[PDB]
Coordinates of all heavy atoms in Angstrom, one line a residue:
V1124 N 116.6 119.2 131.1 CA 115.8 119.6 130.0 C 116.4 120.8 129.4 O 116.7 121.8 130.2 CB 114.3 119.8 130.4 CG1 113.4 120.0 129.2 CG2 113.8 118.6 131.3
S1125 N 116.5 120.9 128.1 CA 117.1 122.1 127.5 C 116.3 122.3 126.2 O 115.9 121.4 125.6 CB 118.6 121.9 127.2 OG 119.3 121.6 128.3
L1126 N 116.3 123.6 125.7 CA 115.6 123.9 124.5 C 116.3 124.9 123.6 O 117.0 125.8 124.2 CB 114.2 124.4 124.8 CG 113.3 125.0 123.7 CD1 111.9 125.1 124.1 CD2 113.8 126.4 123.3
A1127 N 116.3 124.6 122.3 CA 116.9 125.3 121.3 C 115.8 125.8 120.3 O 115.0 125.0 119.9 CB 118.0 124.5 120.6
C1128 N 115.9 127.0 120.0 CA 114.9 127.8 119.2 C 115.1 127.3 117.6 O 114.1 127.3 116.9 CB 114.8 129.4 119.5 SG 116.6 129.8 119.2
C1129 N 116.3 126.9 117.3 CA 116.5 126.4 115.9 C 117.6 125.3 115.9 O 118.3 125.1 116.9 CB 116.9 127.5 114.9 SG 118.6 128.0 115.1
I1130 N 117.8 124.6 114.8 CA 118.8 123.6 114.7 C 120.2 124.0 115.0 O 121.1 123.2 115.1 CB 118.7 122.8 113.4 CG1 119.0 123.7 112.2 CG2 117.4 122.1 113.2 CD1 120.4 123.7 111.7
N1131 N 120.5 125.3 115.1 CA 121.9 125.8 115.5 C 122.1 125.2 116.9 O 123.3 124.9 117.3 CB 122.0 127.3 115.6 CG 122.1 128.0 114.2 OD1 121.9 129.2 114.1 ND2 122.4 127.2 113.2
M1132 N 121.0 124.8 117.5 CA 121.0 124.2 118.8 C 122.0 124.8 119.9 O 122.8 124.2 120.5 CB 121.4 122.7 118.7 CG 120.2 121.9 118.2 SD 120.6 120.3 117.5 CE 120.9 119.3 118.9
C1133 N 121.8 126.2 120.1 CA 122.7 126.8 121.1 C 122.3 126.2 122.4 O 121.1 125.8 122.6 CB 122.3 128.3 121.1 SG 122.7 129.2 119.5
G1134 N 123.3 126.1 123.3 CA 122.9 125.5 124.6 C 123.3 124.0 124.8 O 124.4 123.6 124.4
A1135 N 122.4 123.3 125.4 CA 122.7 121.9 125.7 C 121.7 120.8 125.2 O 121.6 119.7 125.8 CB 122.9 121.7 127.2
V1136 N 121.0 121.2 124.2 CA 120.0 120.3 123.6 C 120.6 118.9 123.2 O 120.1 117.9 123.6 CB 119.3 120.9 122.4 CG1 118.6 119.7 121.5 CG2 118.3 121.9 122.8
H1137 N 121.8 118.9 122.5 CA 122.4 117.7 122.1 C 123.0 116.8 123.2 O 123.6 115.7 122.9 CB 123.5 118.0 121.0 CG 124.7 118.7 121.5 ND1 124.6 120.0 122.0 CD2 126.0 118.3 121.7 CE1 125.9 120.4 122.4 NE2 126.7 119.4 122.2
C1138 N 123.0 117.2 124.4 CA 123.6 116.4 125.5 C 122.7 116.4 126.8 O 123.2 116.3 127.9 CB 125.0 116.9 125.9 SG 125.0 118.6 126.7
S1139 N 121.4 116.5 126.6 CA 120.4 116.5 127.7 C 119.5 115.3 127.8 O 119.4 114.6 126.8 CB 119.5 117.8 127.6 OG 120.3 118.9 127.8
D1140 N 119.0 115.0 129.0 CA 118.1 113.8 129.2 C 116.9 114.1 128.3 O 116.4 113.1 127.7 CB 117.7 113.8 130.6 CG 118.9 113.7 131.6 OD1 119.5 114.7 131.9 OD2 119.3 112.6 131.9
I1141 N 116.4 115.3 128.2 CA 115.3 115.6 127.3 C 115.7 116.9 126.5 O 116.2 117.8 127.2 CB 114.0 115.8 128.0 CG1 113.5 114.6 128.7 CG2 112.9 116.3 127.0 CD1 112.3 114.8 129.7
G1142 N 115.6 117.0 125.3 CA 116.0 118.1 124.5 C 114.9 118.5 123.6 O 114.1 117.6 123.2
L1143 N 114.8 119.8 123.3 CA 113.7 120.3 122.5 C 114.3 121.2 121.5 O 114.9 122.2 121.8 CB 112.7 121.0 123.4 CG 112.0 120.2 124.5 CD1 111.3 121.1 125.5 CD2 111.1 119.2 123.9
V1144 N 114.1 120.9 120.2 CA 114.6 121.8 119.2 C 113.6 122.2 118.1 O 112.9 121.4 117.6 CB 115.9 121.1 118.5 CG1 115.4 119.8 117.7 CG2 116.5 122.1 117.5
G1145 N 113.6 123.5 117.8 CA 112.6 124.0 116.8 C 113.1 123.6 115.4 O 114.3 123.7 115.1
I1146 N 112.2 123.1 114.6 CA 112.6 122.7 113.2 C 111.6 123.2 112.2 O 110.4 123.4 112.5 CB 112.6 121.2 113.1 CG1 111.3 120.6 113.5 CG2 113.7 120.6 114.0 CD1 111.1 119.1 113.0
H1147 N 112.0 123.4 111.0 CA 111.2 123.8 109.9 C 110.8 122.6 109.1 O 111.5 121.6 109.2 CB 112.0 124.8 109.0 CG 112.4 126.0 109.7 ND1 113.8 126.3 109.9 CD2 111.7 127.1 110.2 CE1 113.9 127.5 110.5 NE2 112.7 128.0 110.7
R1148 N 109.8 122.7 108.2 CA 109.4 121.6 107.4 C 109.2 122.0 105.9 O 108.6 121.3 105.1 CB 108.1 121.0 107.9 CG 108.1 120.3 109.3 CD 106.8 119.6 109.6 NE 105.7 120.6 109.7 CZ 104.4 120.2 109.9 NH1 104.1 119.0 109.9 NH2 103.5 121.2 110.0
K1149 N 109.7 123.2 105.6 CA 109.5 123.7 104.3 C 110.8 124.4 103.8 O 111.5 125.1 104.5 CB 108.4 124.8 104.2 CG 107.1 124.2 104.8 CD 105.9 125.2 104.6 CE 104.6 124.6 105.1 NZ 103.5 125.5 104.8
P1150 N 111.1 124.2 102.5 CA 112.3 124.8 101.9 C 112.2 126.3 101.9 O 111.1 126.9 102.0 CB 112.3 124.3 100.5 CG 111.6 122.9 100.6 CD 110.5 123.3 101.5
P1151 N 113.4 127.0 101.9 CA 113.4 128.5 101.9 C 112.7 129.2 100.6 O 112.6 128.6 99.6 CB 114.9 128.8 101.9 CG 115.5 127.6 102.6 CD 114.7 126.5 102.0
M1152 N 112.2 130.4 100.8 CA 111.7 131.1 99.7 C 112.9 131.9 99.2 O 113.8 132.3 100.0 CB 110.6 132.1 100.2 CG 109.4 131.4 100.7 SD 108.3 132.6 101.6 CE 109.0 132.5 103.2
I1153 N 113.0 132.1 98.0 CA 114.2 132.7 97.4 C 113.9 134.1 96.8 O 113.1 134.2 95.8 CB 114.7 131.9 96.3 CG1 115.3 130.6 96.8 CG2 115.8 132.6 95.5 CD1 115.6 129.5 95.7
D1154 N 114.4 135.1 97.2 CA 114.1 136.5 96.7 C 115.2 136.8 95.6 O 116.1 137.5 95.8 CB 114.3 137.5 97.9 CG 113.9 138.9 97.4 OD1 113.6 139.1 96.2 OD2 114.0 139.9 98.2
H1155 N 114.9 136.1 94.5 CA 115.8 136.2 93.3 C 116.1 137.6 92.9 O 117.2 137.9 92.5 CB 115.2 135.5 92.1 CG 115.1 134.0 92.3 ND1 113.9 133.3 92.5 CD2 116.1 133.1 92.2 CE1 114.2 132.0 92.6 NE2 115.5 131.8 92.4
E1156 N 115.1 138.5 93.0 CA 115.3 139.9 92.6 C 116.4 140.6 93.3 O 117.1 141.4 92.8 CB 114.0 140.7 92.8 CG 114.0 142.1 92.1 CD 112.7 142.8 92.4 OE1 111.6 142.2 92.3 OE2 112.8 144.0 92.7
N1157 N 116.5 140.3 94.6 CA 117.6 141.0 95.5 C 118.7 140.2 96.0 O 119.7 140.7 96.6 CB 116.8 141.7 96.6 CG 115.9 142.8 96.2 OD1 116.3 143.8 95.6 ND2 114.6 142.6 96.5
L1158 N 118.6 138.8 95.9 CA 119.6 138.0 96.5 C 121.1 138.4 96.2 O 121.8 138.6 97.1 CB 119.4 136.5 96.0 CG 120.2 135.4 96.8 CD1 119.4 134.1 96.7 CD2 121.6 135.3 96.2
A1159 N 121.4 138.5 94.9 CA 122.7 139.0 94.5 C 123.2 140.2 95.3 O 124.3 140.1 95.9 CB 122.7 139.4 93.0
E1160 N 122.4 141.2 95.5 CA 122.9 142.3 96.2 C 123.1 142.2 97.6 O 123.9 142.8 98.1 CB 122.1 143.5 96.0 CG 121.3 143.5 95.3 CD 121.8 144.0 94.1 OE1 122.9 144.0 93.8 OE2 120.9 144.5 93.6
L1161 N 122.2 141.4 98.2 CA 122.2 141.0 99.6 C 123.1 139.9 100.1 O 123.2 139.8 101.3 CB 120.9 140.6 99.8 CG 119.9 141.5 100.2 CD1 120.4 142.6 100.5 CD2 118.9 141.4 99.4
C1162 N 123.7 139.1 99.2 CA 124.3 137.8 99.6 C 125.6 137.6 98.9 O 125.7 137.9 97.8 CB 123.3 136.6 99.4 SG 121.8 136.7 100.4
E1163 N 126.5 137.0 99.6 CA 127.6 136.4 99.0 C 127.3 134.9 98.5 O 127.5 134.0 99.1 CB 128.8 136.4 100.0 CG 129.7 137.6 100.3 CD 130.6 137.6 101.5 OE1 131.6 136.9 101.8 OE2 130.1 138.2 102.4
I1164 N 126.8 134.7 97.3 CA 126.4 133.4 96.8 C 127.2 132.3 97.3 O 126.7 131.4 98.0 CB 126.5 133.4 95.2 CG1 125.6 134.5 94.6 CG2 126.1 132.0 94.7 CD1 125.6 134.6 93.1
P1165 N 128.5 132.2 97.0 CA 129.3 131.1 97.4 C 129.1 130.6 98.9 O 129.2 129.5 99.2 CB 130.8 131.6 97.1 CG 130.6 132.5 96.0 CD 129.3 133.3 96.4
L1166 N 128.9 131.6 99.7 CA 128.7 131.3 101.1 C 127.4 130.6 101.4 O 127.3 129.7 102.3 CB 128.7 132.6 102.0 CG 130.0 133.4 101.9 CD1 129.8 134.8 102.7 CD2 131.2 132.6 102.4
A1167 N 126.3 130.9 100.6 CA 125.0 130.3 100.8 C 125.2 128.8 100.3 O 124.6 127.9 100.8 CB 123.9 131.0 100.0
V1168 N 125.9 128.7 99.2 CA 126.1 127.4 98.5 C 126.8 126.5 99.5 O 126.4 125.3 99.7 CB 126.9 127.5 97.2 CG1 127.2 126.0 96.7 CG2 126.1 128.3 96.2
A1169 N 127.9 127.0 100.1 CA 128.7 126.2 101.1 C 128.0 126.0 102.4 O 128.4 125.2 103.2 CB 130.0 126.8 101.3
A1170 N 126.9 126.7 102.7 CA 126.1 126.6 103.9 C 125.2 125.4 104.0 O 124.6 125.1 105.0 CB 125.4 127.9 104.2
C1171 N 125.1 124.7 102.9 CA 124.1 123.5 102.8 C 124.8 122.2 103.0 O 125.7 121.8 102.2 CB 123.4 123.5 101.5 SG 122.3 122.1 101.3

């Protein structure tokens, strides 16, 4: 039995008899006012 706190699935969730993975059910909130300054846009685009 193995558990992963998020879909990055660190550990052995993807190869265990029983695996537990934390998942979200809502799209991200977007901080438009500060995103530019805080983010490399192209990287977020390619991250999806």
Side-chain angles (χ1 to χ4, degrees):
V1124 186
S1125 303
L1126 171 160
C1128 55
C1129 80
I1130 62 100
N1131 281 165
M1132 282 160 81
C1133 298
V1136 162
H1137 70 290
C1138 67
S1139 294
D1140 303 85
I1141 294 169
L1143 302 167
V1144 63
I1146 60 162
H1147 299 113
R1148 293 186 296 171
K1149 307 182 176 188
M1152 290 168 277
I1153 294 169
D1154 186 358
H1155 291 107
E1156 190 183 318
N1157 297 295
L1158 195 152
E1160 351 267 22
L1161 272 350
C1162 302
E1163 276 165 78
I1164 303 180
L1166 300 177
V1168 175
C1171 176

